[model samples]
Target: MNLFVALYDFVASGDNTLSITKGEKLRVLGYNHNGEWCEAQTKNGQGWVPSNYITPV
Candidate 1:
């Protein structure tokens, strides 16, 4: 599920993180553990979001 954010400043500001707004359909590529927490990546970029943030497309 490729999620769609409202293009908040978190992203629109050109940050190296992924923060979606408006709760839209999101694409869950997969999950990974870099060190101590799980992170996700989309067609946009990669970032550390709550595991629960990702779901089936």
Candidate 2:
């Protein structure tokens, strides 16, 4: 399991994405083929987030 910290706020505009706040911790599940998006889990839910919005911790 990979851990990451949000570098910026990302508001989920669709069902496939997740809303995350700056400095929030995330568990990275996996990445898309292009690596532009990542599947991640927060305490509340799991969904895709912009890969660039987070950094490995």
Candidate 3:
């Protein structure tokens, strides 16, 4: 597992997103450095969100 901090609020769907907010803590399940995306989970659910918007925590 990986830990990340959301840099800002985002609206997401599909394999990556759970309506994240700024400073939110996300648990990462998978990552694609080339695609620049991460599969993460939040209290809301799990989905692929923008990797650039979050930093390793």
Best by TM-score: 2
| Per-residue lDDT of model 2, residues 1-54, tens digit only | 568999999999979999999999999999999999999999969999999999
- Of models 1 and 2, which has the larger TM-score? 2
lDDT of 1 by residue, 1-54 (tens): 245333223333345346655453445444555433224555556665445544
Task: Please give the ranking of all candidate structures by lDDT, highest first, separated by commas.
Answer: 2, 3, 1
1-57: candidate 3 lDDT, tens digit per residue: 457899989886554356789999989887876868778888788888888888888
| Model 1 TM-score (2 dp) | 0.37
Whole-model Cα lDDT of every candidate shown, in order: 0.46, 0.94, 0.81
What TM-score against the true fold does each predicted structure earn? 0.37, 0.92, 0.76
> How does residue 28 of candidate 1 score in lDDT?
49
Candidate 3 has its poorest 10 consecutive residues by lDDT at 10-19
Candidate 2 local lDDT, residue 25: 95
Model 2 / residue 27 / CA error / Å: 0.4
